Design an enzyme around this catalytic site. Sequence first.
Site, short mmCIF file in Angstrom:
data_model
loop_
_atom_site.label_atom_id
_atom_site.label_comp_id
_atom_site.label_asym_id
_atom_site.label_seq_id
_atom_site.Cartn_x
_atom_site.Cartn_y
_atom_site.Cartn_z
N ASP K 91 0.87 -1.39 -0.26
CA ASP K 91 -0.14 0.06 0.10
C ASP K 91 0.84 1.44 -0.04
N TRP K 126 -8.86 33.11 -12.97
CA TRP K 126 -8.32 32.01 -11.89
C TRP K 126 -6.90 32.58 -11.17
N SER K 157 -2.89 18.28 -1.47
CA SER K 157 -1.80 17.91 -2.49
C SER K 157 -0.29 17.63 -2.05
N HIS K 240 3.50 28.39 -13.21
CA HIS K 240 4.09 27.50 -14.26
C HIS K 240 4.45 26.28 -13.97
N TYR K 244 2.87 22.13 -15.48
CA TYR K 244 3.83 20.90 -15.92
C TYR K 244 3.24 19.65 -14.83
N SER K 255 3.22 7.19 -22.16
CA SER K 255 4.37 6.16 -22.46
C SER K 255 4.06 4.70 -22.02
N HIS K 291 4.99 34.94 -18.03
CA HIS K 291 3.65 35.13 -17.80
C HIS K 291 3.37 36.84 -17.21
N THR K 316 11.30 17.98 -24.04
CA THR K 316 10.24 17.81 -24.46
C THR K 316 10.12 16.94 -25.98
N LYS K 319 11.10 13.45 -25.68
CA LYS K 319 10.02 12.45 -25.52
C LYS K 319 9.14 12.22 -26.67
N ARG K 438 -9.08 38.49 -24.12
CA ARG K 438 -9.67 37.47 -23.13
C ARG K 438 -10.41 37.87 -21.95
C1 HEA Z 1 -0.85 21.70 -19.75
C2 HEA Z 1 0.09 22.35 -19.44
C3 HEA Z 1 0.66 23.15 -20.30
C4 HEA Z 1 1.72 22.98 -21.10
C5 HEA Z 1 2.30 21.71 -21.10
C6 HEA Z 1 2.29 24.03 -21.62
C7 HEA Z 1 3.40 24.27 -22.19
C8 HEA Z 1 4.12 25.24 -22.42
N1 HEA Z 1 3.60 26.52 -22.44
FE1 HEA Z 1 2.11 27.12 -21.86
N2 HEA Z 1 0.15 27.92 -20.96
C9 HEA Z 1 -0.70 26.80 -20.32
C10 HEA Z 1 -0.50 25.68 -20.42
C11 HEA Z 1 0.61 24.88 -20.27
N3 HEA Z 1 1.46 25.14 -20.96
C12 HEA Z 1 -1.62 27.67 -19.60
C13 HEA Z 1 -2.62 27.26 -18.82
C14 HEA Z 1 -1.14 28.90 -19.74
C15 HEA Z 1 -2.06 30.29 -19.72
C16 HEA Z 1 -2.79 30.31 -18.30
C17 HEA Z 1 -3.30 31.98 -17.90
O1 HEA Z 1 -2.49 32.77 -18.11
O2 HEA Z 1 -4.39 32.03 -17.62
C18 HEA Z 1 -0.25 29.08 -20.87
C19 HEA Z 1 0.22 30.19 -21.03
C20 HEA Z 1 1.52 30.11 -21.69
C21 HEA Z 1 2.64 31.37 -21.81
C22 HEA Z 1 1.92 32.83 -21.60
C23 HEA Z 1 1.32 33.64 -22.62
C24 HEA Z 1 0.52 35.07 -22.30
O3 HEA Z 1 -0.65 34.81 -21.57
O4 HEA Z 1 1.16 35.96 -22.69
C25 HEA Z 1 3.75 31.01 -22.19
C26 HEA Z 1 4.58 31.97 -22.85
O5 HEA Z 1 5.77 31.62 -22.88
C27 HEA Z 1 3.27 29.58 -22.49
C28 HEA Z 1 4.50 28.71 -23.13
C29 HEA Z 1 4.55 27.52 -22.94
C30 HEA Z 1 5.70 26.64 -23.44
C31 HEA Z 1 7.05 27.29 -24.08
C32 HEA Z 1 5.63 25.10 -23.24
C33 HEA Z 1 6.35 24.04 -23.44
O6 HEA Z 1 6.15 23.18 -22.64
C34 HEA Z 1 6.05 23.58 -24.87
C35 HEA Z 1 7.06 22.61 -25.57
C36 HEA Z 1 6.33 21.70 -26.58
C37 HEA Z 1 6.93 21.61 -27.67
C38 HEA Z 1 7.69 22.56 -28.32
C39 HEA Z 1 6.31 20.33 -28.82
C40 HEA Z 1 7.20 19.03 -28.81
C41 HEA Z 1 8.96 19.12 -29.12
C42 HEA Z 1 9.12 18.99 -30.48
C43 HEA Z 1 8.18 18.52 -31.72
C44 HEA Z 1 10.34 19.29 -30.86
C45 HEA Z 1 10.90 20.38 -31.84
C46 HEA Z 1 10.39 21.70 -31.06
C47 HEA Z 1 11.06 23.01 -31.64
C48 HEA Z 1 12.46 22.82 -32.13
C49 HEA Z 1 9.98 24.11 -31.58
N4 HEA Z 1 2.24 29.17 -22.25
C1 HEA Z 2 -7.90 21.21 -17.56
C2 HEA Z 2 -8.35 22.57 -17.92
C3 HEA Z 2 -9.32 23.20 -19.01
C4 HEA Z 2 -9.95 22.25 -19.86
C5 HEA Z 2 -10.03 20.81 -19.84
C6 HEA Z 2 -10.70 23.31 -20.34
C7 HEA Z 2 -11.91 22.86 -21.06
C8 HEA Z 2 -12.80 23.67 -21.79
N1 HEA Z 2 -12.45 25.20 -21.76
FE1 HEA Z 2 -11.42 26.25 -20.67
N2 HEA Z 2 -10.06 27.20 -19.41
C9 HEA Z 2 -9.21 26.65 -18.78
C10 HEA Z 2 -9.11 25.37 -18.32
C11 HEA Z 2 -9.83 24.35 -18.88
N3 HEA Z 2 -10.88 24.55 -20.02
C12 HEA Z 2 -8.70 27.93 -17.97
C13 HEA Z 2 -7.30 27.71 -16.89
C14 HEA Z 2 -9.11 29.08 -18.52
C15 HEA Z 2 -8.60 30.32 -18.20
C16 HEA Z 2 -9.63 31.10 -17.04
C17 HEA Z 2 -9.14 32.71 -17.18
O1 HEA Z 2 -9.13 33.47 -17.77
O2 HEA Z 2 -8.87 32.98 -15.77
C18 HEA Z 2 -10.28 28.42 -19.35
C19 HEA Z 2 -10.80 29.42 -20.62
C20 HEA Z 2 -11.65 29.11 -21.28
C21 HEA Z 2 -12.21 29.98 -22.16
C22 HEA Z 2 -11.82 31.28 -22.28
C23 HEA Z 2 -12.80 32.46 -21.43
C24 HEA Z 2 -12.20 33.88 -21.50
O3 HEA Z 2 -10.90 34.15 -21.47
O4 HEA Z 2 -13.13 34.57 -21.96
C25 HEA Z 2 -13.22 29.29 -22.70
C26 HEA Z 2 -13.94 29.75 -23.91
O5 HEA Z 2 -13.99 29.08 -25.11
C27 HEA Z 2 -13.21 27.74 -22.48
C28 HEA Z 2 -13.63 26.73 -23.18
C29 HEA Z 2 -13.47 25.32 -22.70
C30 HEA Z 2 -14.31 24.35 -23.04
C31 HEA Z 2 -15.50 24.74 -24.24
C32 HEA Z 2 -13.89 23.19 -22.64
C33 HEA Z 2 -14.25 21.93 -23.33
O6 HEA Z 2 -13.35 21.31 -24.05
C34 HEA Z 2 -14.58 20.83 -22.05
C35 HEA Z 2 -15.18 19.68 -22.44
C36 HEA Z 2 -15.16 18.71 -21.84
C37 HEA Z 2 -13.93 18.10 -21.55
C38 HEA Z 2 -13.09 17.78 -22.44
C39 HEA Z 2 -13.58 17.42 -20.15
C40 HEA Z 2 -14.45 16.00 -20.01
C41 HEA Z 2 -13.50 15.13 -19.49
C42 HEA Z 2 -13.76 14.61 -18.36
C43 HEA Z 2 -14.92 15.55 -17.34
C44 HEA Z 2 -13.24 13.53 -17.67
C45 HEA Z 2 -14.36 12.51 -17.30
C46 HEA Z 2 -13.79 11.66 -16.18
C47 HEA Z 2 -13.43 10.45 -16.79
C48 HEA Z 2 -12.96 9.73 -17.83
C49 HEA Z 2 -13.17 9.53 -15.40
N4 HEA Z 2 -12.11 27.59 -21.44
CU LIG Z 3 4.13 29.44 -17.82
#
Ligand code: HEA
Ligand code: HEA
Ligand SMILES: [Cu+2]
Lengths: 98, 84, 84, 43, 261, 109, 56, 227, 47, 46, 514
Positions: K91, K126, K157, K240, K244, K255, K291, K316, K319, K438
């Site tokens: 467990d 948020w 958490s 941030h 992740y 994976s 941000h 990334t 991966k 937004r």
């Molecule tokens: C699920 C979580 C998630 C993930 C995984 C990512 C991943 C990343 N995000 Fe994020 N992002 C969000 C979710 C997350 N983010 C959220 C929630 C916000 C807005 C929240 C808010 O402000 O309300 C946000 C906002 C946000 C900002 C702010 C923009 C703004 O509001 O002005 C930035 C800017 O740097 C950013 C960048 C990135 C980057 C660089 C990664 C990197 O991890 C991406 C890396 C992935 C790849 C690049 C692809 C795989 C790699 C390859 C295929 C190889 C080749 C690649 C190159 C040579 C380019 N994201």
């Molecule tokens: C996990 C994070 C998450 C996810 C999944 C989504 C899903 C959705 N989001 Fe949201 N969204 C955010 C987090 C997320 N959002 C955040 C961080 C903001 C920013 C807030 C801010 O501005 O402060 C936002 C902002 C945001 C906006 C912009 C609002 C604005 O800035 O004016 C809109 C509008 O189109 C929107 C759309 C949607 C929609 C239509 C879905 C749809 O795709 C949802 C459809 C349903 C699903 C895909 C989930 C279903 C899956 C399950 C429920 C799991 C079931 C469980 C088992 C299998 C056991 N989201």
């Molecule tokens: Cu960030």
Amino acid sequence: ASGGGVPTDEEQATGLEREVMLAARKGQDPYNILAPKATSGTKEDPNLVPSITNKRIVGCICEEDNSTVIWFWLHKGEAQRCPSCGTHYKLVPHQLAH
Amino acid sequence: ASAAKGDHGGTGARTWRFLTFGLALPSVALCTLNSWLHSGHRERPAFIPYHHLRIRTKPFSWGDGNHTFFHNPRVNPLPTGYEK
Amino acid sequence: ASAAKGDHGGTGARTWRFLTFGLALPSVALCTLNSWLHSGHRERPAFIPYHHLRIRTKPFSWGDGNHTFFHNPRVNPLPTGYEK
Amino acid sequence: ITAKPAKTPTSPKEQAIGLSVTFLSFLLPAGWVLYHLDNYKKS
Amino acid sequence: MTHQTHAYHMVNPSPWPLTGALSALLMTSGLTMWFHFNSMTLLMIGLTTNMLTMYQWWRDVIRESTFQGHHTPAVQKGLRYGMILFIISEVLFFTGFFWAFYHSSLAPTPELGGCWPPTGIHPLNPLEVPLLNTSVLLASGVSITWAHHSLMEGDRKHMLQALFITITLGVYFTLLQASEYYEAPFTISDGVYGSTFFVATGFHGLHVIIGSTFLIVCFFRQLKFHFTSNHHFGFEAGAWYWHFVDVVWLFLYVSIYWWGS
Amino acid sequence: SHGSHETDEEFDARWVTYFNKPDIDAWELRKGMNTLVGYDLVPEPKIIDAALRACRRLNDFASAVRILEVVKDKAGPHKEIYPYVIQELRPTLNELGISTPEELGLDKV
Amino acid sequence: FENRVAEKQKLFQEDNGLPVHLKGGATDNILYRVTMTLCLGGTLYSLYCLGWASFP
Amino acid sequence: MAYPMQLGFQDATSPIMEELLHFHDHTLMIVFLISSLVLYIISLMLTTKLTHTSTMDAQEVETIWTILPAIILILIALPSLRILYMMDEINNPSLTVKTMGHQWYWSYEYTDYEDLSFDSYMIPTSELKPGELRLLEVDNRVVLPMEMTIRMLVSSEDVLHSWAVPSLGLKTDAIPGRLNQTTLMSSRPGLYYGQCSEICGSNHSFMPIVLELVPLKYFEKWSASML
Amino acid sequence: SHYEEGPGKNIPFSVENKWRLLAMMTLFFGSGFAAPFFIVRHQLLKK
Amino acid sequence: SVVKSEDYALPSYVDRRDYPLPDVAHVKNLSASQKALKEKEKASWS
Amino acid sequence: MFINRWLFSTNHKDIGTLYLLFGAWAGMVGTALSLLIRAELGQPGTLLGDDQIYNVVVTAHAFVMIFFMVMPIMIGGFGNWLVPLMIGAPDMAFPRMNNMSFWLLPPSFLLLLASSMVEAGAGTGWTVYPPLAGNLAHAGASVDLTIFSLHLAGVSSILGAINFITTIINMKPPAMSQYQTPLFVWSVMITAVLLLLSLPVLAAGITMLLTDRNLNTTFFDPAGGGDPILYQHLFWFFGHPEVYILILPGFGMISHIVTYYSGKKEPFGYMGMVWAMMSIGFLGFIVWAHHMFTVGMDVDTRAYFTSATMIIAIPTGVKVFSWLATLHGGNIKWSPAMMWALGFIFLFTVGGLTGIVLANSSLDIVLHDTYYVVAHFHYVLSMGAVFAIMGGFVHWFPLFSGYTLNDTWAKIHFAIMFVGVNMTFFPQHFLGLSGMPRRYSDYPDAYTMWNTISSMGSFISLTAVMLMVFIIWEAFASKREVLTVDLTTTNLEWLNGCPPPYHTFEEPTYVNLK
Ligand code: HEA
Ligand code: HEA
Ligand SMILES: [Cu+2]
Ligand SMILES: [Cu+2]
Ligand SMILES: [Cu+2]
Ligand SMILES: [Mg+2]
Ligand code: NA
Ligand SMILES: [Zn+2]
């Protein structure tokens, strides 16, 4: 000599703690705290997997490097072999449990 | 300053008891005499209604909601002015 | 900044070999690219005969006794003025 | 993945009922609430 | 299976996580009524169920360990990791507070007078009582160390003695600090200087109280012969938390009391 | 083990030998094939021959047939491979009296 | 001082089928029942509050 | 301003907003390459009957898919960094307007000499004269001298706001107690609209920004007539 | 330990009758989805 | 043959291209005639 | 009995189930909030009312999806269930504490709900930044209730993170090194570390905001000499890593899913896969400020934050390429979950690529606070995090329940959900390039088409979730108990049958020391 009065484990350890404590001094490991060192695993010199029951999951790290472990139930009876490398495993009854 | 009290400041309960009564405590004694050989009293600071002090954006949920938790009348003035 | 590279940065040669090529070296690589992605050249500072600089209370026991050990002609002026 | 046949199989009829009940339970309440929005804003 | 052949602990169902979860609700929503619909009944109920829960939860923890013999080697090694990890999370909590402070003092707004400490604020003298408290906590660190050495050498009287001296210096710091709070010419309401000084020193103050009661608990478990020379994690953990508590004070002292004033 | 890599000929050899162990038993017969299928190649007729025979040694007709199925499967989209294989295997096929999957009509759904 | 830990051990090791938080005696139960009650009531009270405070 | 069915950025009215259009083409060109490279390799992997499930060697290939992306990032980082400094570059403005976010309107202040200062509210959809843009119209346009380097100092008197005008490639959060600088510089006379880019209350969506850029001369008279 | 085991015994809800479950499941996810709507209604019906 | 849930620790059968020869026989129990067919199998396959 | 099993538990399995349960329910809620948002934006004008009632909905969407659905499901559910099984543990390390980690969620969820009931709720985004979040702009019990919900959810958490790290590190078979544990476990162990460090800082940030609106402190009030920006730092320092923390576990399950349906023994480049995660974990801690590009920071420091944010593209990258290499010589099985995996691989890529565009501060000046970033994170969350959740769910459902899902129904669901999301979020890329901001309850007429298409998209997604409920019902309705599972030699969670007995590994596994 000369101390002050705090209890020793040898005199105050109870439950499982004591059980594993004593077994330790006798050199046995009824509670799987240590890693079973391997044998040549030949058909004649198999690894003897003790067990408190008729079957036991065996994980086989075929090669030292291996990030992947091969799992499989070892049942009571004829020596079995790891699917990826032969290697013999023969069940054996567990000991100092209770 | 520095520090180099010759030997023993490590392993052995006797050694630790030794530093406790030989160093640790005499220190607290010096510092205690010291802190009281200067334990007079500050004159309450002249009051000037500065805006970045005596801040009140919302009343404290206790008393007349205008008196800080450890409000000390002598040295702590209300926003209006000293207690009295 | 901070740091939290998940797990293993402790005991086991394999783990230390891992940080060596997984963290340690890539850093030196980044920093090396960096330090050369800015490896241009500073313009030799304008000469002004300040007295608290180019100090000479006694001639250096080497050369014309007026040139510092790692004297670099371009960016290091003598007390009189730049090399040339 | 292999599996024994269904101890209690669900015939297409059943499945339609179940799919129906599910969709309604999601769509009615929200529908009602949304249907009367004006009436709420008008108080 | 059935008879377990692993040295691990399978804890019996306990209703404590639920009452403890419920306690967090009571206290948080309890603080909300207070802060707003000005009332403390809920908060009182919350703080109560909470104390009740913690008392019983650790009670069971001792029962299982000292009486039932469930803390094998494998079991304690994991309690170390857990405590170690828990302390780290506390170290990161205080970081927000130090961050806030260095942010505010390193670049003072014109509203403060464009200087630090802001005009109007009269800082305490680090050389007065803040030094006394520094020396007090430090001495307890050495006496608690003498206590742990006596323990591992089976000397009951002396462990109990060094532990007592420790506990009292810790209480002496609480009182000393309490009076500074009273005598101090600033407050939580005096802008950033007050805000920053009172919550950092304040959260730290709550930690010395939490750490002292921990030691007090260890004091009693010892009168009762609970600890052996080699198994006394409750005390190891107590000492760790205590050392964490000095070090934070050493950092507040140098930052807020000295440099920041 | 590490870096120990054989030339093509050394590979085929190692396998033909593996399968010819007179005392080879079922475990090993299965292990051998289930292992050989993981590689990037349709096995050499000489290796497939030895395994067909060891099936006989273990008096396993079925396994002998499934082995011929695999060979074809492994050719993927390369139609030319299977027939060449069945060709170099005719003699042994005839000798041990092993029916091809196609002859047995097992090639249809 | 005392040192009747051994007595406490035997007591808590007694196979009475009770769970550790009750193995101790009668008070364990009163404490349990008290704690469980205040928690529930408290939860109800807060539910009442967060609702009375939900309307203007 | 934006037209119906827009795909990309609104036409660039200033040199940096142009400069960014190209840096974005560059960048967007690359995301297309990578994202199509990945969709290809994927469909490839899934399109064969040939198997090879035994162990496979790593890193020898991992050097490739590690050194390559590093190169590509240098190819984006450089141009990006260039533009960034160029934006925060040494310019000499010949005018300084200030603007202050308020909970649901912007007030503007021109005060180099005389103290000209007015408000700026959105024109209610009702009070719109045929042809006026539904939610972008403001009663008082901020008038500025086209083709001139202007220094804007953004701020607020309450919650956070953000003064943004896309066509010129500008956005600067408005923070109480803070004076953020931004250099505006058009090269075309007209009307350039913008909106409050920072959540701030009930009417977060109803506090637009409109720049009316006329030649110097018309600016001078406008100012005086404005008091 | 009186803990039942196997398919349909490791969950806190009864899985014996496909139809009683249809009801339970429906109320469960149902209430989840509806709540936000009624919260918005609540806000709208205030002054 | 009939597979049982409790059989989770016993070797099993599985049809899949990359494991051509499974750990277990599809049919464990034989009829007289099958036991007979099995006998003929020790003889020449021809 | 029921009380003891379901309220007084100390079983990783029973607890993991209770999580998924809480997670499914909360998901339903966030789904509706998400649907109101589009119902409000699918036609020019105002449907609900002012930005206040609208933004209250938005904030409630963000919080419910992140803290109440994704986190509980991926970490508390799949985390509690599978971790002890993959490493052969009896467990978790702290069973009782673990139970508390669950029971803190509902209270935390109630507070969050109550916040929108009292006064006008918290229309603050948020990010709950001040002054807007302050006692003037948002006077009343709402924001405070939002803060207490967050404290509880955080306590939960970090308490969970302590159990996972201790368990994963201290309860493996004596002869098994960490370089022998499955990638999912590494993913949950690294995520656990990230929470352990970031969450405390959020708790300090929000505790400050609380004293700022209740005990007259001025941390973020210029009046007292405070800084509204200082809050942004503290929050983002946690903000941030959180994104992740939300993907790493998904990275793990992917994976596992991809390896399993390729018929491979292990995934390609295991140690590179381990290094890749460790790096993402680390870099994610020193880039928060991307941000705050349009905030007024020094150009030099704005340079550092774009450069550091880009290097993350590298690990990334290894991966994404390693998973493609895993599919390689594979004997592919087109299962429902494999469809969720492939979906994740491409969609997450486009989305993390679209996020490289945003790393550029220069260019971020005009993309910030627009719908372009809404697109970005909806791709990695709605078709990254959520796509992993679905694959993992349809993949391990038999293990948890003992019953199988209807694969065809399972695929239809995918087919639907795919169209829904891509439709919903693709156009938003334009809405943002073309300037639509937004957090707006309404937009200039120009933005009408795309918001209209996007909302239509949001309706299809709804259908897919209603369908998923039925799919689970049918599964429990018919009762097709499992008989055989492939690849168990390399897949320990499947060795005790479906479902595994209340007490597994009562007798340790046996693993030799070579
Ligand atoms: C699920 C979580 C998630 C993930 C995984 C990512 C991943 C990343 N995000 Fe994020 N992002 C969000 C979710 C997350 N983010 C959220 C929630 C916000 C807005 C929240 C808010 O402000 O309300 C946000 C906002 C946000 C900002 C702010 C923009 C703004 O509001 O002005 C930035 C800017 O740097 C950013 C960048 C990135 C980057 C660089 C990664 C990197 O991890 C991406 C890396 C992935 C790849 C690049 C692809 C795989 C790699 C390859 C295929 C190889 C080749 C690649 C190159 C040579 C380019 N994201
Ligand atoms: C996990 C994070 C998450 C996810 C999944 C989504 C899903 C959705 N989001 Fe949201 N969204 C955010 C987090 C997320 N959002 C955040 C961080 C903001 C920013 C807030 C801010 O501005 O402060 C936002 C902002 C945001 C906006 C912009 C609002 C604005 O800035 O004016 C809109 C509008 O189109 C929107 C759309 C949607 C929609 C239509 C879905 C749809 O795709 C949802 C459809 C349903 C699903 C895909 C989930 C279903 C899956 C399950 C429920 C799991 C079931 C469980 C088992 C299998 C056991 N989201
Ligand atoms: Cu960030
Ligand atoms: Cu605004
Ligand atoms: Cu706004
Ligand atoms: Mg912003
Ligand atoms: Na609208
Ligand atoms: Zn092996």
